[PDB]
Every structure is written in C-alpha cells, then in structure tokens.
Design a protein around this ligand. Structure first.
Ligand SMILES: N=c1n(CCN2CCCCC2)c2ccccc2n1C[C@@H](O)COc1ccc(Cl)cc1Cl
Length: 156
C-alpha cells in the first residue's frame, strides 16, 4: 500500500526538481539531471556526471516530505555502448543542507543496482525513509555512470 511511483517517469516531478553534482555535455548529447527518468527515450536520455567517480550524485527534491519505500534504477544504452551503475549509496535531507546516509545492518547500505543498461532494478528501503530530498551516490559502474530512476512511496 506504499509503493507508488512518485513521478520521475510520469514527469509529475518536474525538471527543476532534479539536480546533480555535475553533468556531461558534448556536441552529441546533454546528459542533464532531469533526463534521469525511468524508461526515457531519445538521444539525451539519462543523467551522466561530468566525470566518473564516487564523488558524484543525483538529487531529487519532492518539495515536501514524503515516505520513500523504494528506488528503481536503470542505466542507458547509448548507441552501441552500455552504461550502468552497479552499486550506490543513498542520502537524504529535510532541509537540503544536512544529509544522512541510509544505514542497514550497522553500516552505510551499499545498494546493489543494475546488471544491464535497460532493465530496471527495484531496491527497497526498510525502514521507510521520511524525507524531502533524496541523493543517489554511484559507487561502482560498468564503463560510465548513467542513471534513469524512479522513486516509490507514499505520503509522510
Ligand atoms: N565500480 C567501479 N569503479 C569505482 C568504484 N569502485 C569502488 C572503489 C574502487 C573501484 C570500484 C570504477 C572506476 C573506473 C572504472 C570502472 C569502475 N567500476 C566498475 C568496475 O568495478 C567494473 O566495471 C567494468 C566491467 C567491464 C568493463 Cl569493460 C568496464 C568496467 Cl568499468
């Protein structure tokens, strides 16, 4: 009863609500944070950071506190090149300034993500996370960091 998609795919979460540490842009594509939407199609259809390393993150602002019970991630196939995140951390905030890493079994939870570019993987957050902001912190990846996502939950 609390696993509704919050709006990444449907665009109920608007472009302005999605930001990142950095993003990659060249003459070919602009891999903006707001392209990080599950199942999005087109030439620029994922978020990619400017550089590949664990200091990078993607942020969503729900603009009120929500109950988050899951996140869904996907990579992207760009031309003939597979790109996906294999492992990631989550952090959260109510005020946008002070952040908290999601813990499980006594340590920061390392979420196991994707195994290809195109198939979604759902990761449950237990206990549920009550938060206004959510950040995803890629830790490992195949070839390049690329993300399309969804957030699952309900009202706080
Ligand atoms: N997790 C990664 N990291 C950093 C995250 N890690 C924790 C710190 C040490 C390295 C793993 C990578 C850095 C550069 C390149 C790949 C990285 N990965 C994913 C790598 O762990 C494995 O991914 C690959 C598999 C096949 C090919 Cl052809 C290419 C790649 Cl990249």
């Amino acid at each position: 009863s609390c696993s509704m998609p919050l709006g990444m795919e449907s665009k109920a979460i608007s472009d302005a609500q999605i930001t990142a540490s950095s993003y990659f842009t060249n003459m070919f594509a602009t891999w903006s944070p707001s392209k990080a939407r599950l199942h999005l199609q087109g030439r620029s259809n994922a978020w990619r950071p400017q550089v590949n390393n664990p200091k990078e993150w993607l942020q969503v602002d729900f603009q009120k506190t929500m109950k988050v019970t899951g996140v869904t991630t996907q990579g992207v196939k760009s031309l003939l090149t597979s790109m996906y995140v294999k492992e990631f951390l989550i952090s959260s905030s109510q005020d946008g300034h002070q952040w908290t890493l999601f813990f499980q079994n006594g340590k920061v939870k390392v979420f196991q993500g994707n195994q290809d570019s195109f198939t979604p993987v759902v990761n449950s957050l237990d206990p549920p996370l009550l938060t206004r902001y959510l950040r995803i912190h890629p830790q490992s990846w195949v070839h390049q960091i690329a993300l399309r996502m969804e957030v699952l939950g309900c009202e706080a």
